[PDB]
Amino acid sequence: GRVYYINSHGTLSRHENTLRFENAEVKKDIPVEDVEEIFVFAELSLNTKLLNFLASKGIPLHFFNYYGYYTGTFYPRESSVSGHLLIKQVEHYLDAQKRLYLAKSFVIGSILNLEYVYKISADTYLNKVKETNSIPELMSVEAEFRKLCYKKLEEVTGWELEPPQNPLNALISFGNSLTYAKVLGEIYKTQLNPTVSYLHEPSRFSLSLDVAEVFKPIFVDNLIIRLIQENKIDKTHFSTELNMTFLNEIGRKVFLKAFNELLETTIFYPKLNRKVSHRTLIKLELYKLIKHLLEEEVYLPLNYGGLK
Amino acid sequence: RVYYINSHGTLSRHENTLRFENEVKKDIPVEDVEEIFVFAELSLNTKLLNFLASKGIPLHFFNYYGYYTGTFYPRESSGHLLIKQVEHYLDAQKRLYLAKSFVIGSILNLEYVYKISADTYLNKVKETNSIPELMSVEAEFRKLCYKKLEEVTGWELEKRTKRPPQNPLNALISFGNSLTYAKVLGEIYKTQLNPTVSYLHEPSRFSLSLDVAEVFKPIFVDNLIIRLIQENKIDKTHFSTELNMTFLNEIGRKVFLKAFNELLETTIFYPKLNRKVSHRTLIKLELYKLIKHLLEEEVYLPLNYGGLK
Amino acid sequence: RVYYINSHGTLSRHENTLRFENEVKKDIPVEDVEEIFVFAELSLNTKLLNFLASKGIPLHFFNYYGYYTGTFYPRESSGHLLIKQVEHYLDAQKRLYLAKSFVIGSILNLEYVYKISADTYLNKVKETNSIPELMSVEAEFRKLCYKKLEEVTGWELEKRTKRPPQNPLNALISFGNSLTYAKVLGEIYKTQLNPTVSYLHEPSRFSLSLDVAEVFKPIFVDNLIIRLIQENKIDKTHFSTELNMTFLNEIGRKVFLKAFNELLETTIFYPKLNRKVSHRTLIKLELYKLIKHLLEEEVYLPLNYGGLK
Amino acid sequence: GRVYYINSHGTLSRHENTLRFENAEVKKDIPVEDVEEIFVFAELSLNTKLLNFLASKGIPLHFFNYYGYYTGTFYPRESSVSGHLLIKQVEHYLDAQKRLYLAKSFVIGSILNLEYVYKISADTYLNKVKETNSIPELMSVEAEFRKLCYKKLEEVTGWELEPPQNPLNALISFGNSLTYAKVLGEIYKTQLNPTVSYLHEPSRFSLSLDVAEVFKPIFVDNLIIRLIQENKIDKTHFSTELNMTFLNEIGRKVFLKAFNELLETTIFYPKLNRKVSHRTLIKLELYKLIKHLLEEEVYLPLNYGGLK
């Protein structure tokens, strides 16, 4: 378990070249070598001695408040920088034709994966994408198919779908933020700059937003459907306080355990003739993008259905 | 607009503002803060971070010596500059203009330091049509300066050597250059400019610090070296030679480091501001000029140190 | 085939051969010489040069310490390699193969030094499809090694820092790396390979020395550092820290330099040659492998130091 | 006079950060700062202290023997290197289409300048160049026009033209070598590698051979015609010894003075709205090539006639 999740209130610190979490009930040492990223969901006291240490090991920290609302990320000083790649990233944005191809690829990845999850024909939508030259249009089309899938999510779950006013909306927002953060963490480990995107305007980490479009159906929608239909997540995993409905502590733990188990679940990847983790699919997707920006190979979005 | 934290302590949310404690307890109106830079050891918690996120205020962390460790980026911070930076690189014409500007600044300031007429070389710079050609002209003027450096000091230079420096002068130049690149990079990190995008030097780590330093090296390195040697503050006993390698010793580094820092802290009248600013601030002001240039606001003109006397 | 001049003296034409004098007077059959490398102070004249030109023999000049100064090139010397070098760079597939080879050599030798199983990472290297991806894997294994370096020495590392080194270990790594790049470059200049063309590192000064050094750094730097620290030859008194900068002092440099040179002079049995060669010669042998690779003769395989024990 | 010519037997050495030439009759100090290149035509004693000094100032040394025969050059360690440019130089050679364009441009530059000097129509030859795709053919065509011009050189001078067996052949060889050397010296000052060419095979400094093709008509043919017709060079400036005819000492000095005065003669250069030296035309030609290799501007060979 390379990703570390903190669900208890306490103090996180650097202790003898390792991490230490402590509160009134516990004091555990966590070898910083087995930690690649940290998600924080509780009240935590920390200091620069800790942050400078995490920065040194290249460990991003993601924060979520009482309501499970993602508030921000401690993004460490970059480990590896590539001026060439950076130029190419921006070049593919400045050139309308290059940017269009990428903007479309991300939308296609999103539609294809939503189609796999919701089993709704996307041919009509994919056709519009193939025929337009307007990025704003692509967005419009993607939002149209996304809307269709939300209407179906509501039917397949039986939960009402509309700041989350409903348990389902809470689940969607929580899963989406977890995905945005996880993707951001993967971008950090590469030479890619997280602010240069092609679908979404470059602001906010726009590249994470673009890439997450391809993965959200897998880490969010699909997981939510299974958790609700298999009765893993139910109405007792949510709370409504001051007209604020949110995934609570117990529910948050159920979802995170499911999210992390999915991240670590392996799947056969033809190109490597071996099974890779879902987390690795994100990494591999980033390297496919990099190779595209380097003009070495055309970028094709992950067609998750094809691996199943 | 920007809040700098230079002392160790604790930062937290108190009521609806920020509070710093350590001896001293100070409330800081958050309504004014756009960004917070931390240059000291700090204790904080999620209550503080979530509060900053709610206000859209990023929190930049640096260790005591200025080494950047990372930034807490709010979900929604209240990348245009980056695009503009690369834009002026991709457009060969825009790139060449900036590359020439840094060289012109280097030449103008070497002129002030060495007192070698730059009139003809500045015109030659204007005439070049590519970066390679531009560099050849810079190398020519640079050669005239190193020759004079040998004459005004009486020390051997012969040729610029860096791997490794073959004599005291090259050892001093390398040390001074390093201190200058670091100082400039430090100022860059205090702005929104990405340090990886340069125009004179090839971007392919922090190339922008190299470009901007061209304008300041004559003042922080050449000029200082000449002063220290002629005033007998740096002499032959401040160096150690191993085989073909010459190194500035401990005592030597301290002497130079101290003078460098004192120079950076020295103030000088800045007309446009109608007040005296330190030499470090001149770097910031130079970066501000580059930004306004990249933003299509006002054309970048290199610092003509001599104009400030 | 190649004649090396390592002692000071006079080189001239005598009858129809070469003659070196200084104490000693030696005639050198020119019929055997293809190239002449000079590593000492030499006196000569045009009669000698015209004679070498007539035979088509180039005369390469280096100062006593190995610094290349220039070459007397005959009108007709009796650039194919250069074309082949760039050819393997332009072909992304050929470049990637070479970049992976140097990384594999680095990993194999770090494995021998740190005793950390490289099996999985070597397979990951094989799977990468681009230089950026390849570098990420190298960085991963490198991280495991620096962690162990801290454990087997008890000294702080925390992270690789170079501008400037923030602690003794980084100061030693930077010094050792520098000595290694120089040593490798020196061997490159003794071959016909252009030092500017690399595959792992971006060509855009002497990038090839950087690539090839990846294979030797674990042996000449990491391994030596560990040995010197564990045997108490290099300790805390061999360093000086200024603010955030840590430097290896005079005594420290001498100790390390001496050990480095002694290591390079150490011999080890080389199976394919069925004899013992120095560690410096292993570099030359590695360059020979690269050349035969670039000439489409035999595929380049990095040096697996452990295989030599 | 940045170029230095040594026509007396002696010793050249470094003396107090300057150069010193000495023999039995003289001892002069030459500030190394005013020296950019040195051509040697007499017996000279030298050492590494001198060569390492010249290398430091980036001063190439060209050697010529008793017969005025160019024997070689001391090419110093490069002052400025550019890995990018080097890649681009070889790239334009490896790619048949890129190499063809350059191979043709050099031949065109040669034919156009020979045409200006000899006043012989080259349309027929230029047409063949424009229609072929064979570099060997280009050479064949260039050699054909070159042959025509030699036949005319013989008529316009009245000197017989054929190791130089005739005074005219001696002049041509001497001037050609001086040009090859001078061009090599200009290449040294740039980031260009002298061994990568497009017309001539990359060996020998093939790039100097290519570029010299464009300039030889100006520094050799044209100068020879004027020197002979104006009676500056005559039969007493040559010697025949052991069936070896060569430009002798007095003649060598007449030619070198003429060659150097031409190098320093200025000519109006529209693009700069000012007059530049002929030596600068060589430099400018190299930068035109560099800009072409960098994919910034198409390379067009110097049309000397156009500046007159």
Show Cβ contacts of residue D155 under 8 Å, excluding neighbours closer than 6 positions: none
Peptide bond into C203 cis (omega under 30): no
8 Å CB contact between C276 and C285: no
Please report where in the chains the tokens 């007397």 appear, as a residue.
C72
Cβ burial of D34 (10 Å; 0-12, 13-18, 19+) is: exposed
A84 touching B (Cβ < 8 Å)? yes
Q: Which residues of C touch D83 (CB under 8 A)?
A: 196-198, 202-205, 207
Annotated binding-site ranges of B:
138, 201, 214
Are both C31 and C177 inside the same structural domain? no
Burial of residue A136 (number of CB atoms within 10 Å: 0-12, 13-18, 19+) = exposed
Q: Does D287 touch chain B (CB under 8 A)?
A: yes
CA–CA distance, B238 with B227 (Å, rounded to integer): 15
Residues of A in contact with C127 (CB under 8 A): 272
Of B44, B74, B87, which has the smallest distance from its Cβ to A46's Cβ? B44
Q: Is A38 exposed, middle or buried (0-12, 13-18, 19+ CB in 10 A)?
A: buried
Residues paired with residue A267 on neighbouring β-strands, in sequence order:
A276
- Between CA C237 and CA C93 the distance in angstroms is 49
Q: How far apart are CA C89 and CA C202, in angstroms?
A: 10
Phi first, then psi, for residue A78 (nearest 5°) are -60, 135
D141 and D53 together in one domain: no
Q: What is the CA radius of gyration of chain B?
A: 22
Burial B163-183 (b: 16+ CB within 10 A, else e): ebbbbbbbbbbbbbbebbbbb
Best probe of the B interface among D187, D294, D300, by most B CBs < 10 A, is D294
Largest CA distance in chain B: 66
Considering only residues 241 to 270 of chain B, which have any Cβ-Cβ distance to chain D shorter than 8 Å? none
- For C163, the closest of B182, B244, B250 (CB atoms) is B182
Can you tell me the distance from the alpha carbon of D53 to that of D17, in angstroms, rounded to the nearest whole number?
8
First to last CA, chain C: 32
Do C67 and B166 count as a contact with CB atoms less than 8 A apart? yes
Question: DSSP letters along C168-233, please?
Answer: HHHHHHHHHHHHHHHHHHHHHHTSS--TT--SSS-----HHHHHHHHHHHIIIIIHHHHHHHHTTS
Rg of chain C (C-alpha set): 22
Q: Report CA D293 to chain centroid distance, whole Å.
A: 22
Residues 6+ apart with CB under 8 A from A96: none
Contact C28, C1 (CB under 8 A): no
Q: Please tell me whether residues C152 and C289 are part of one structural domain.
A: yes
Flag if C132 and A17 touch (Cβ within 8 Å). Answer: no
- Residue A102 CB partners (closer than 8 Å, separation 6+): A92, A198, A199, A210, A289, A292, A299
Range of the domain at A60: 1-80
Q: Please give the structure tokens belonging to residue A7.
A: 């669900």
Which residues are CB-contacts of D37 (< 8 A; sequence separation ≥ 6)? D2, D3, D4, D59, D60, D61, D62, D182, D185
- Distance between CA D304 and CA D215 in Å, rounded? 9
Interface with chain C: mutation pick from B135, B244, B246, highest number of C CBs within 10 Å: B244
Q: Report d(CA C194, CA A92) in Å as an integer.
A: 33
**Token reading at B145:** 């300066």
What is the total count of domains within chain D?
2
Would you tell me the crossing angle of helices C92-114 and C131-153 to the nearest 10 degrees? Answer: 10
Q: Tell me how crowded residue B297 is: count the other CB atoms within 10 A of its CB.
A: 10
User: Rounded CA gap, A70 and A64, in Å?
Assistant: 4
Please judge whether A75 and B70 are an interchain contact, meaning their C-beta atoms are less than 8 angstroms apart.
Answer: yes
Q: Is residue B164 reached through a cis peptide bond, with omega within 30 degrees of 0 on the bond before it?
A: yes
Chain B closest-CA separation from residue A114 CA (Å): 25
**Distance from C130 to chain A by nearest Cα, in Å?**
7
D window 31-50, beta carbon within 8 A of C: 40, 42-49
Three-state DSSP state, B296? coil
Q: Are B110 and B145 in contact (CB under 8 A)?
A: yes
Domain end, chosen from D80, D96, D120, is at D80
CA torsion sign for B183, B187, B193, B199 is negative
Residue keyed to tokens 């025969």: D69
In DSSP terms, B4 is beta-bridged to B37
**Phi, psi (deg, nearest 5) at residue C93:** -70, -45
Strand, helix or coil for residue B254: helix
Joined tokens for residue C172: 């030693």
The C-alpha atoms of residue D45 and residue D47 are separated, in whole angstroms, by 7
Give chain A positions within 8 Å (CB) of B53: 63, 71-72
Residues B179, B185, B191: CA angle, nearest 5 degrees? 150
Q: End of a domain among B25, B60, B75? A: B75
CATH number (domain holding residue B101):
1.20.120.920
Q: Give the closest-approach CA distance of B39 to chain A in angstroms.
A: 10
Question: Which H or E element spans position D270?
Answer: none
Experimental method: X-ray
Specify whether the CB–CB gap between A102 and A209 falls below 8 A. no
Q: Which residues pair with D239 in a beta bridge?
A: D246
Q: Do chains A and D touch (3 or more CB pairs under 8 A)?
A: no
**Amino acid letter at B79?**
G
Sequential DSSP letters for B196-208: T--SSS-----HH
Same domain, A18 and A164: no
Q: What is the C-alpha separation between A62 and C254, in angstroms, rounded?
A: 47
**Residue numbers after which chain B breaks, C to N beyond 2.5 angstroms:** 22, 78, 204
Tracing tokens 């924080």 back to the chain, one arrives at A40
B217: its two tokens: 């090296």
Q: Within this chain, do residues B289 and B228 fall inside the same structural domain, yes or no?
A: yes
Under a CB-based contact definition with an 8 Å cutoff, are residues D171 and D224 in contact? yes
Residues B8, B41 contacting (CB under 8 angstroms) = yes
DSSP states along D150-200: HHHHHHHH--------SHHHHHHHHHHHHHHHHHHHHHHTSS--TT--SSS
Provide the H-helix boundaries in D95-166.
96-118, 123-131, 135-157
What share of residues in chain B are helix, strand, coil (percent, to 5)? 55, 15, 30
Using a CB–CB cutoff of 8 Å, tell me whether B156 touches chain C: no
**Are B33 and B147 within one domain?**
no
**Nearest chain B CA: its distance from C275 CA (Å):** 31
**CA-atom Rg of chain D in angstroms:** 20
The strand ranges marked E within chain B are 2-5, 9-14, 17-21, 25-28, 35-38, 42-45, 59-62, 68-74, 239-242, 245-248, 267-270, 275-278
Ramachandran assignment for C45, one of left (phi > 0), alpha (psi -120 to 50 degrees), beta (any other): beta
Mark whether B66 and B80 lie in a shared domain: no
Measured between alpha carbons, how far is A222 from B77 in angstroms, rounded to an integer? Answer: 30
CA–CA distance, D167 with D244 (Å, rounded to integer): 10
Residues 6 or more apart in contact with residue D231 via CB below 8 angstroms: none
Task: Quote the tokens at residue D61.
Answer: 């040394």
Give A73: exposed, middle or buried? Use CB within 10 Å, 0-12, 13-18, 19+: buried
Residue A40 sits in the same domain as residue A144: no
Q: What contacts 24+ positions apart, CB below 8 Å, involve B253-256?
A: B253/B175, B253/C242, B253/C247, B254/C242, B255/B228, B256/B172, B256/B175, B256/B176, B256/B179, B256/B224, B256/B228
Inter-chain touch A291–C130, beta carbons under 8 Å: yes
User: Angle at CA A277, nearest 5°, toward A273 and A281?
Assistant: 80
Q: Are B79 and A202 within 8 A, CB to CB?
A: yes
A84 annotated as a binding-site residue = no
Contact C291, C80 (CB under 8 A): no
User: Mutual orientation of helices C223-230 and C168-189 as an angle, nearest 10°?
Assistant: 140
φ, ψ of residue B206 to 5 degrees: the values are -95, 60
Residues B36 and B123 in one domain: no
Top residue of A71, A79, A176, A192 to mutate, by most chain B CBs within 10 Å, is A71
Write the secondary structure of chain A as one string of H (helix), E (strand) and C (coil): CCEEEECCCEEEEEECCEEEEECCCCEEEECHHHCCEEEECCCEEEEHHHHHHHHHHCCCEEEECCCCCEEEEEEECCCCCCHHHHHHHHHHHHCHHHHHHHHHHHHHHHHHHHHHHHCCCCHHHHHHHHHCCCHHHHHHHHHHHHHHHHHHHHHHHCCCCCCCCCHHHHHHHHHHHHHHHHHHHHHHCCCCCCCCCCCCCCCCCHHHHHHHHHHHHHHHHHHHHHHHHCCCCCHHHEEEECCEEEECHHHHHHHHHHHHHHHHCEEEEHHHCEEEEHHHHHHHHHHHHHHHHCCCCCCCCCCHHHHC
Is residue A38 a contact partner of residue A59, using CB atoms and an 8 Å limit?
yes
Q: Phi and psi (nearest 5°) for A109?
A: -60, -40
- To which H or E segment does residue C44 belong? strand C42-45
Residues B120, B126: Cα–Cα separation, whole Å: 10
Residues A219, A220, A223, A226, Cα dihedral to 10°: -160
End-to-end Cα separation, chain D, in angstroms: 24
Q: Output the CA torsion A210→A215→A221→A224 (10° steps).
A: -120
B304, B214: one domain: yes
Amino acid in the structure at residue B62? F
CA C204 centroid distance within chain? 19
Instruction: Tell me the residue type at D242.
Output: L
Residue of D nearest to B131 (CA): D291
Judge whether B186 and B138 are in contact, CB under 8 Å.
no
| Chain centre distance of CA B166 | 26
Examine the fold and report which residue of D50, D80, D110 is the final residue of a domain before the chain moves on.
Answer: D80
Of B41, B74, B197, the CB nearest to A48: B41
Nearest to B132 among D33, D53, D82 (CB): D82
Q: Is B15 exposed, middle or buried (0-12, 13-18, 19+ CB in 10 A)?
A: exposed
Nearest chain B alpha carbon to A207: B79
Write the residue in B74, B90, B203 that is nearest to A83 by C-beta: B203
The one-letter amino acid code at C253 reads R
Q: Radius of gyration (Cα) for chain A, nearest Å?
A: 20
Outline where chain C has alpha helix (H). 46-55, 80-90, 92-114, 119-127, 131-153, 168-189, 207-217, 223-230, 250-265, 279-294
Q: How many CA atoms lie within 13 A of B202 on its CB side?
A: 16
Which among C131, C138, C141 is the top mutation candidate for probing chain A, defined by the most A β-carbons within 10 Å of its own β-carbon?
Answer: C131
**A7/A19 Cα distance (integer angstroms):** 16
Amino acid letter, residue C290: L
From chain B, pick out residues whose CB is under 8 angstroms from the CB of C65.
243-244
Structural contact between residues A106 and A129, judged by C-beta atoms closer than 8 angstroms? no
Q: Cα–Cα distance between D46 and D53 in angstroms, integer?
A: 12
Residue B35, helix vs strand vs coil: strand
CB of C75 within 8 Å of any CB in chain D? yes
Contact call for residues B155 and B165 (beta carbons, < 8 A): no
Could you tell me which residues come within 8 angstroms of residue B104 by beta carbon, excluding any fewer than 6 positions away? B122, B125, B302
What is the β-pairing status of strands A70-76 and A274-277? unpaired
- Report the chain C residue with the minimal C-alpha distance to residue B182: C163
Largest CA-CA distance found in chain D, in angstroms, rounded: 61
Pairing outcome for strands A3-6 and A37-40: parallel
**What resolution (Å)?**
2.0
B97: tokens are 């203009």
> Which residues is B12 bridged to in the sheet?
B19
Q: Cβ distance C299 to C290 under 8 Å? A: no
**Are D85 and D72 part of one and the same domain?**
no
Q: Which amino acid is at C295?
A: L
Report the distance separating Cα A47 and Cα A29, nearest Å. Answer: 17
Per the CB < 8 A criterion, the answer to whether A56 and A78 are in contact is no
- Is residue B100 located within the same domain as residue B67? no
Tokens (6 digits) for A160: 């009402």
What lies within 8 Å, CB to CB, of D16 at 6+ separation is: none
Q: Closest residue of B to C202, CA-based? A: B204
- Does the beta-carbon distance from A87 to B197 stay under 8 Å? yes
